């Protein structure tokens, strides 16, 4: 059906035109097992003060919009006690419930790919040059692609058809994805598990996955309709646990 209700903590998401839920690689998020742990100290698990919904700022969708990306867990670095637990701990581990939402009308048209790319390591715009970390991702700001190539001396290559990774943008549909087609679809929800080659990791020096939102069919409508449609991203951590309590970081 098209209705779905997601409740995590003291927060609820309701949707009246839901496509489905994409669950990761078929895996639900869970806590780390005893036969897979490496650290020996007892973890902390704030179950409802951290595994709740945190909404980000909306982005204005235009006809000439190329797309936006968010890098995680650095996108939620200041979102409540999820951000306070990142500062005080060396290791962390979590899965997510990403919920992207955009309604327009029955008189608008457009389509957005919503991919979750694990280890979306981006190249440089100006080559033979290392880039700054604040150009890759600010703390909650939506970093955005471009229609043509970037000549930034210290930034990523934001041409959208190469997706910043040197690949074809059409081949991103192996990563866990949905589509927001404005003809039929209102939102898009992806449940990501923890994907890493280590059981826990540091949540500052490593972007575990990157959420991209890309217009494949661009937004067009009559000039007498609503010219402003926003795209809001609401992300909930899931089964978040932490290790290595020390002073507040993060250098």
């Amino acid at each position: 059906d098209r209705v779905r209700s997601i409740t995590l903590g003291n927060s609820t998401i309701t949707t009246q035109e839901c496509a489905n839920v994409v669950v990761g690689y078929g895996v639900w998020p869970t806590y780390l097992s005893d036969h897979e742990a490496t650290a020996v100290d007892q973890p902390t698990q704030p179950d409802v003060a951290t595994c709740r919904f945190y909404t980000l700022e909306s982005v204005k969708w235009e006809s000439s919009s190329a797309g936006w990306w968010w890098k995680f867990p650095e996108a939620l670095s200041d979102m409540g006690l999820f951000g306070q637990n990142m500062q005080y701990h060396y290791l962390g581990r979590t899965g997510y419930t990403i919920h992207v939402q955009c309604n327009a009308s029955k008189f608008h048209q457009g389509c957005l790919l919503v991919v979750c790319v694990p280890e979306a390591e981006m190249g440089a715009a100006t080559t033979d040059h290392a880039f700054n970390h604040t150009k890759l991702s600010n703390i909650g700001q939506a970093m955005e692609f471009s229609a043509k190539k970037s000549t930034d001396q210290t930034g990523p290559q934001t041409a959208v058809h190469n997706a910043g990774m040197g690949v074809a943008v059409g081949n991103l549909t192996i990563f866990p994805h949905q589509w927001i087609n404005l003809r039929t679809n209102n939102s898009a929800t992806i449940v990501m598990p923890y994907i890493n080659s280590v059981p826990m990791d540091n949540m500052y020096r490593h972007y575990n996955f990157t959420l991209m939102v890309i217009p494949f069919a661009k937004l067009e409508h009559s000039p007498q309709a609503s010219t402003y449609v926003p795209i809001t991203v609401t992300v909930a951590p899931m089964c978040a646990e932490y290790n290595g309590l020390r002073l507040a970081g993060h250098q």
């Binding site: 098209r2 496509a19 489905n20 839920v21 994409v22 669950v23 690689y25 078929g26 039929t184 449940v191």
Partner: protein
């Protein structure tokens, strides 16, 4: 400790013998004959099941 296995033959004297010579399993040959697969992690990773004949929405 000889492992007699089935050789790769076609469809319409078909066996080989293997002895392991070294004490490390990284010294072994390739596992050529393992063709297991399950593509539902990628092609149909949705929460509710989607039957083909029924409408998707």
């Amino acid at each position: 400790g000889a492992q007699v296995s089935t050789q790769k033959t076609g469809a319409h004297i078909i066996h080989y013998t293997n002895i392991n010579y070294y004490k490390d399993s990284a010294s072994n040959s390739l596992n050529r004959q393992d063709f297991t697969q399950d593509p539902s992690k990628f092609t149909e990773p949705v929460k509710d099941v989607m039957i083909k004949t029924l409408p998707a929405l």
